[PDB]
Design a protein around this ligand. Sequence first.
Ligand SMILES: O=C(O)C[C@H](c1ccc2c(c1)OCCO2)c1ccc2ccc(OCC(=O)NC3CCCCC3)cc2c1
Length: 290
Amino acid sequence: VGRLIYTAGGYFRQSLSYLEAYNPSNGSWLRLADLQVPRSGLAGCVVGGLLYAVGGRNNSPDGNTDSSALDCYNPMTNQWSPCASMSVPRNRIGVGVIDGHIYAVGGSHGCIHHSSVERYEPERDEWHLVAPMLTRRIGVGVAVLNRLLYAVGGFDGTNRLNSAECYYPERNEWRMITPMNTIRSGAGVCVLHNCIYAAGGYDGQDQLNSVERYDVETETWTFVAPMRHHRSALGITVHQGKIYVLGGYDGHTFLDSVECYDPDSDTWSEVTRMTSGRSGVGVAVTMEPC
Ligand SMILES: O=C(O)C[C@H](c1ccc2c(c1)OCCO2)c1ccc2ccc(OCC(=O)NC3CCCCC3)cc2c1
């Protein structure tokens, strides 16, 4: 009990510093401490009850600065603190957590599209590089299932991708997996039960409402019910057995919609609206602030 969906940063006209938290139990939103630096294209994750904001870019009227930053938010204090920075700036990053370590995957730095991957150790406040992916990927979806790390889709600098790959930590090795049925950059990627889900994104032509899921045992991708809204650069998380998608861009509007997927019924429902439309947010779940 007492867990909230946190949304950090984002983009609307410029990169945003907002930290807002939604309570699925009562529908309430709270505005919390702003990020020290506005960022879009970042990822959020939680280790040990602390919320981490990783990477991104500060788009402002006075510049565009890709971020190598790792910042941690403590809900007990409602304060952000800087952590050790990554080896490189990574905009449109993907992040996953394995056994208390944060993996930062891909992303861009100017015209560079990274294949590099690095791993954060909160106990030592240190980053170290690990094996790079087989493909350069920005706007990559990342999720962790059964202590394996998946990198899904993205953009390699020339083509948007339907390919995906899996990292095996004990061998420090990446292997390709079955590609998705759809090309997707800027999808929301998460894990629910035994599947990796890829929701929305941009196929090079249109923003997508389709959603597909990879069963790690059968190695197949299967479509599920589509979202109500086409969305790229959406936020995504899982909470109490349901997927939540937040915001994004539908080709016309920066969305304030939040939709919830129920796997038992294979349906999406609109559950709330953010306080303003935005894309490129980082999202994660942790305890409510004190
Ligand atoms: O395919 C690609 O080139 C990369 C891809 C991408 C680029 C251009 C697009 C697009 C998708 O769809 C709409 C058409 O223009 C991508 C993917 C993930 C992102 C994640 C965060 C993020 O943060 C900052 C952010 O929201 N900016 C938005 C500006 C207004 C709409 C697009 C993103 C950006 C991401 C961008």
